[PDB]
Amino acid sequence: PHARRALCLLLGPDFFTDVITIETADHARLQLQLAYNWHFELKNRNDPAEAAKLFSVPDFVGDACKAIASRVRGAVASVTFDDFHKNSARIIRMAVFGFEMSLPKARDQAVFPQNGLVVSSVDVQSVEPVDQRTRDALQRSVQ
Amino acid sequence: SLPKARDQAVFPQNGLVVSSVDVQSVEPVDQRTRDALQRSVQLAIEITTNSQEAAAKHEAQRLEQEARGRLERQKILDQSEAEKARKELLELE
Amino acid sequence: LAIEITTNSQEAAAKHEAQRLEQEARGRLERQKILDQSEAEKARKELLELE
Amino acid sequence: PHARRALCLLLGPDFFTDVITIETADHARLQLQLAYNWHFELKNRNDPAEAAKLFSVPDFVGDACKAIASRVRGAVASVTFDDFHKNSARIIRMAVFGFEM
C-alpha cells in the first residue's frame, strides 16, 4: 500500500514487476507475474492544469496495478484453465484493454484519464499455479 | 448503455462520486468451500488429460487403420503379381 | 452439495463431450476402414482376374 | 531487476545471455537460454530529441528481455511439446516478431 516514497514522479517508460493471484472459471487458484509497460502522456507540457493533473492520484503505481489486476481476474474467472493456458497472453491482453478497433484485437493503448498514465502494453511472465495439486498432477499429463 | 448501467456512482449528500469499483479476491473463508472445490480442479484437469489421451488414442487408431489399409493394398497387389507369374508357371507345368 | 452439483455437472459435460469425440473418431474410423477395404477389393478385382 | 550500473549506454551490436522458464500447451515446464542479438538504431545522430530518447527507459536490457520472454512464452503455451521440439527455432522466431512480410 505504501512502501516507496520519492520527490520525483517518474514519467519515462517503465514497468511494474507485479504478481497477481487470480482464479479461473474452473476455480483453479493461480498466481502470475505481470510487467505493465507504462508511460505518462502529456500533450501540452507547460499547462498548469494538465501538468498538475499528474499528481492527482497519490499512488498511481498501486492504482494502475490494482485496476489492471481486477480487470484481468474478472475476465479470467469467466474462462476455463485450458483456455487460459492456450491463449494465456491473448486473453489477458484482451482483458486489460477489452475493445475492438483492429476475436479481433482491441487497440494498443490503456489510458487512465485521471492522471494521463497510459499502460502501453501488458506482459505475463509465469503461470505459477501455486497449489501442489494443480502442480504435479498436471505433471502426469506431460508424462 | 444485461446492458451496462453507467460510469458514475454519485452520493448527492456530499458530492462523493465512486468512479469505479474493483474486486481483488473471492476468498471464501470456510474450509469446506475451500479444498472441496479443490477436488473440482483435480477433476477439471482430469477431464483434460483424459480428453487429450482419448484424442491421441483416436489418432493412433486412425493411423493404425490407415497403415493396415495400405498393407492390405500391398498384400493384394503383391499377390496379384504372384498370380501373374504363376500364370506362366502353370503354362509351363 | 452446492459445489458438488457443479463438479458433477462439469464432469458430466466433459464425459458427454468425450463420448461425442469418441463416436466421431469411431465414425471416421468406420469411414476409413470401409474405404480402405473398397480399395483392397478394387485391387482384388485384378488379382482375381489374374487368378 | 537492478544488478549492473554504468555511465555509458552500449549502442553497439551485442546479445543477452538470458534464460527463460516457459511452459508449453501440454503443461511441460521447460527453461531455455536466449541470445537477443540487438543494437540501437539512430537515423539522425545529432538531434537532441531522438538522442535523448535512448535514455527514456532506464533498464532497457531488462525491458527487452522481459518483453521478449513474455511474447515467446505466450506463443509457446499454445503449441504442444512435439511442435516446440521440431520447430523449436522456427516458432520462437515467429513468436518474437510475429507478422507476415
PDB file of all heavy atoms in Angstrom, chain C residues 32-46:
ATOM      1  N   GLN C  32     -12.823 -44.787 -42.830  1.00  0.00           N
ATOM      2  CA  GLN C  32     -11.530 -45.172 -43.388  1.00  0.00           C
ATOM      3  C   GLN C  32     -11.430 -46.682 -43.581  1.00  0.00           C
ATOM      4  O   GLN C  32     -10.834 -47.146 -44.560  1.00  0.00           O
ATOM      5  CB  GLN C  32     -10.399 -44.661 -42.497  1.00  0.00           C
ATOM      6  CG  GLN C  32      -9.051 -44.622 -43.191  1.00  0.00           C
ATOM      7  CD  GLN C  32      -7.902 -44.424 -42.227  1.00  0.00           C
ATOM      8  OE1 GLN C  32      -7.430 -45.370 -41.600  1.00  0.00           O
ATOM      9  NE2 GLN C  32      -7.441 -43.186 -42.107  1.00  0.00           N
ATOM     10  N   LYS C  33     -12.002 -47.464 -42.662  1.00  0.00           N
ATOM     11  CA  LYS C  33     -11.962 -48.918 -42.797  1.00  0.00           C
ATOM     12  C   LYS C  33     -12.696 -49.373 -44.050  1.00  0.00           C
ATOM     13  O   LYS C  33     -12.206 -50.228 -44.797  1.00  0.00           O
ATOM     14  CB  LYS C  33     -12.566 -49.580 -41.557  1.00  0.00           C
ATOM     15  CG  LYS C  33     -11.572 -49.869 -40.449  1.00  0.00           C
ATOM     16  CD  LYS C  33     -12.235 -50.610 -39.298  1.00  0.00           C
ATOM     17  CE  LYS C  33     -11.207 -51.095 -38.288  1.00  0.00           C
ATOM     18  NZ  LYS C  33     -11.849 -51.659 -37.069  1.00  0.00           N
ATOM     19  N   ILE C  34     -13.879 -48.809 -44.297  1.00  0.00           N
ATOM     20  CA  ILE C  34     -14.665 -49.209 -45.460  1.00  0.00           C
ATOM     21  C   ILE C  34     -13.990 -48.747 -46.746  1.00  0.00           C
ATOM     22  O   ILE C  34     -13.946 -49.482 -47.739  1.00  0.00           O
ATOM     23  CB  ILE C  34     -16.102 -48.668 -45.337  1.00  0.00           C
ATOM     24  CG1 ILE C  34     -16.791 -49.273 -44.113  1.00  0.00           C
ATOM     25  CG2 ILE C  34     -16.899 -48.969 -46.587  1.00  0.00           C
ATOM     26  CD1 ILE C  34     -16.794 -50.786 -44.098  1.00  0.00           C
ATOM     27  N   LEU C  35     -13.453 -47.525 -46.748  1.00  0.00           N
ATOM     28  CA  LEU C  35     -12.787 -47.012 -47.943  1.00  0.00           C
ATOM     29  C   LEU C  35     -11.540 -47.828 -48.274  1.00  0.00           C
ATOM     30  O   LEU C  35     -11.305 -48.182 -49.437  1.00  0.00           O
ATOM     31  CB  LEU C  35     -12.437 -45.537 -47.752  1.00  0.00           C
ATOM     32  CG  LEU C  35     -13.529 -44.546 -48.159  1.00  0.00           C
ATOM     33  CD1 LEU C  35     -13.143 -43.127 -47.770  1.00  0.00           C
ATOM     34  CD2 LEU C  35     -13.815 -44.641 -49.649  1.00  0.00           C
ATOM     35  N   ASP C  36     -10.732 -48.140 -47.258  1.00  0.00           N
ATOM     36  CA  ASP C  36      -9.557 -48.975 -47.484  1.00  0.00           C
ATOM     37  C   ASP C  36      -9.949 -50.365 -47.962  1.00  0.00           C
ATOM     38  O   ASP C  36      -9.286 -50.928 -48.840  1.00  0.00           O
ATOM     39  CB  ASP C  36      -8.718 -49.064 -46.211  1.00  0.00           C
ATOM     40  CG  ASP C  36      -8.111 -47.732 -45.819  1.00  0.00           C
ATOM     41  OD1 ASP C  36      -7.847 -46.911 -46.723  1.00  0.00           O
ATOM     42  OD2 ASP C  36      -7.899 -47.506 -44.609  1.00  0.00           O
ATOM     43  N   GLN C  37     -11.020 -50.933 -47.405  1.00  0.00           N
ATOM     44  CA  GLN C  37     -11.499 -52.219 -47.894  1.00  0.00           C
ATOM     45  C   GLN C  37     -12.027 -52.113 -49.319  1.00  0.00           C
ATOM     46  O   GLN C  37     -11.901 -53.067 -50.093  1.00  0.00           O
ATOM     47  CB  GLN C  37     -12.575 -52.776 -46.963  1.00  0.00           C
ATOM     48  CG  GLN C  37     -12.033 -53.327 -45.655  1.00  0.00           C
ATOM     49  CD  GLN C  37     -13.121 -53.571 -44.630  1.00  0.00           C
ATOM     50  OE1 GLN C  37     -13.793 -54.603 -44.654  1.00  0.00           O
ATOM     51  NE2 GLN C  37     -13.302 -52.621 -43.722  1.00  0.00           N
ATOM     52  N   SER C  38     -12.610 -50.970 -49.691  1.00  0.00           N
ATOM     53  CA  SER C  38     -13.027 -50.789 -51.078  1.00  0.00           C
ATOM     54  C   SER C  38     -11.832 -50.752 -52.020  1.00  0.00           C
ATOM     55  O   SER C  38     -11.886 -51.337 -53.106  1.00  0.00           O
ATOM     56  CB  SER C  38     -13.857 -49.515 -51.230  1.00  0.00           C
ATOM     57  OG  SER C  38     -13.157 -48.385 -50.752  1.00  0.00           O
ATOM     58  N   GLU C  39     -10.748 -50.077 -51.630  1.00  0.00           N
ATOM     59  CA  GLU C  39      -9.538 -50.090 -52.451  1.00  0.00           C
ATOM     60  C   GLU C  39      -8.942 -51.493 -52.527  1.00  0.00           C
ATOM     61  O   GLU C  39      -8.451 -51.923 -53.582  1.00  0.00           O
ATOM     62  CB  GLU C  39      -8.516 -49.097 -51.894  1.00  0.00           C
ATOM     63  CG  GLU C  39      -9.036 -47.673 -51.759  1.00  0.00           C
ATOM     64  CD  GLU C  39      -9.250 -46.991 -53.098  1.00  0.00           C
ATOM     65  OE1 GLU C  39      -8.771 -47.517 -54.125  1.00  0.00           O
ATOM     66  OE2 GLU C  39      -9.904 -45.927 -53.123  1.00  0.00           O
ATOM     67  N   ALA C  40      -8.971 -52.219 -51.407  1.00  0.00           N
ATOM     68  CA  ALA C  40      -8.499 -53.597 -51.402  1.00  0.00           C
ATOM     69  C   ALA C  40      -9.316 -54.466 -52.345  1.00  0.00           C
ATOM     70  O   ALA C  40      -8.755 -55.304 -53.052  1.00  0.00           O
ATOM     71  CB  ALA C  40      -8.544 -54.164 -49.982  1.00  0.00           C
ATOM     72  N   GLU C  41     -10.637 -54.277 -52.375  1.00  0.00           N
ATOM     73  CA  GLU C  41     -11.472 -55.020 -53.314  1.00  0.00           C
ATOM     74  C   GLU C  41     -11.201 -54.594 -54.752  1.00  0.00           C
ATOM     75  O   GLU C  41     -11.244 -55.424 -55.669  1.00  0.00           O
ATOM     76  CB  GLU C  41     -12.947 -54.832 -52.966  1.00  0.00           C
ATOM     77  CG  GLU C  41     -13.828 -55.993 -53.387  1.00  0.00           C
ATOM     78  CD  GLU C  41     -13.539 -57.257 -52.604  1.00  0.00           C
ATOM     79  OE1 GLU C  41     -13.235 -57.153 -51.397  1.00  0.00           O
ATOM     80  OE2 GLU C  41     -13.621 -58.355 -53.193  1.00  0.00           O
ATOM     81  N   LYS C  42     -10.927 -53.305 -54.970  1.00  0.00           N
ATOM     82  CA  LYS C  42     -10.515 -52.855 -56.296  1.00  0.00           C
ATOM     83  C   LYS C  42      -9.305 -53.636 -56.783  1.00  0.00           C
ATOM     84  O   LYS C  42      -9.317 -54.182 -57.890  1.00  0.00           O
ATOM     85  CB  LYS C  42     -10.195 -51.360 -56.285  1.00  0.00           C
ATOM     86  CG  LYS C  42     -11.398 -50.445 -56.282  1.00  0.00           C
ATOM     87  CD  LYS C  42     -10.994 -49.027 -55.913  1.00  0.00           C
ATOM     88  CE  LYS C  42     -12.148 -48.054 -56.081  1.00  0.00           C
ATOM     89  NZ  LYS C  42     -11.840 -46.724 -55.488  1.00  0.00           N
ATOM     90  N   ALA C  43      -8.257 -53.709 -55.960  1.00  0.00           N
ATOM     91  CA  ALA C  43      -7.064 -54.460 -56.349  1.00  0.00           C
ATOM     92  C   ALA C  43      -7.360 -55.953 -56.469  1.00  0.00           C
ATOM     93  O   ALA C  43      -6.829 -56.634 -57.360  1.00  0.00           O
ATOM     94  CB  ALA C  43      -5.937 -54.213 -55.351  1.00  0.00           C
ATOM     95  N   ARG C  44      -8.198 -56.479 -55.575  1.00  0.00           N
ATOM     96  CA  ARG C  44      -8.572 -57.886 -55.628  1.00  0.00           C
ATOM     97  C   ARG C  44      -9.310 -58.211 -56.917  1.00  0.00           C
ATOM     98  O   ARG C  44      -9.307 -59.363 -57.355  1.00  0.00           O
ATOM     99  CB  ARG C  44      -9.421 -58.238 -54.402  1.00  0.00           C
ATOM    100  CG  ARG C  44     -10.118 -59.589 -54.459  1.00  0.00           C
ATOM    101  CD  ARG C  44     -10.711 -59.970 -53.113  1.00  0.00           C
ATOM    102  NE  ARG C  44      -9.693 -60.074 -52.073  1.00  0.00           N
ATOM    103  CZ  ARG C  44      -9.684 -59.352 -50.961  1.00  0.00           C
ATOM    104  NH1 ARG C  44     -10.624 -58.456 -50.710  1.00  0.00           N
ATOM    105  NH2 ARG C  44      -8.705 -59.533 -50.079  1.00  0.00           N
ATOM    106  N   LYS C  45      -9.929 -57.214 -57.549  1.00  0.00           N
ATOM    107  CA  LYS C  45     -10.562 -57.459 -58.843  1.00  0.00           C
ATOM    108  C   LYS C  45      -9.544 -57.931 -59.878  1.00  0.00           C
ATOM    109  O   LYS C  45      -9.738 -58.973 -60.518  1.00  0.00           O
ATOM    110  CB  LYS C  45     -11.281 -56.201 -59.329  1.00  0.00           C
ATOM    111  CG  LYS C  45     -12.022 -56.387 -60.643  1.00  0.00           C
ATOM    112  CD  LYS C  45     -12.821 -55.148 -61.008  1.00  0.00           C
ATOM    113  CE  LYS C  45     -13.632 -55.369 -62.273  1.00  0.00           C
ATOM    114  NZ  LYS C  45     -12.760 -55.533 -63.469  1.00  0.00           N
ATOM    115  N   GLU C  46      -8.441 -57.195 -60.048  1.00  0.00           N
ATOM    116  CA  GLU C  46      -7.422 -57.645 -60.991  1.00  0.00           C
ATOM    117  C   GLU C  46      -6.694 -58.876 -60.468  1.00  0.00           C
ATOM    118  O   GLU C  46      -6.276 -59.733 -61.257  1.00  0.00           O
ATOM    119  CB  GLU C  46      -6.410 -56.540 -61.324  1.00  0.00           C
ATOM    120  CG  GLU C  46      -6.978 -55.183 -61.741  1.00  0.00           C
ATOM    121  CD  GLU C  46      -7.664 -54.461 -60.612  1.00  0.00           C
ATOM    122  OE1 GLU C  46      -7.349 -54.789 -59.453  1.00  0.00           O
ATOM    123  OE2 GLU C  46      -8.485 -53.558 -60.877  1.00  0.00           O
TER     124      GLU C  46
END
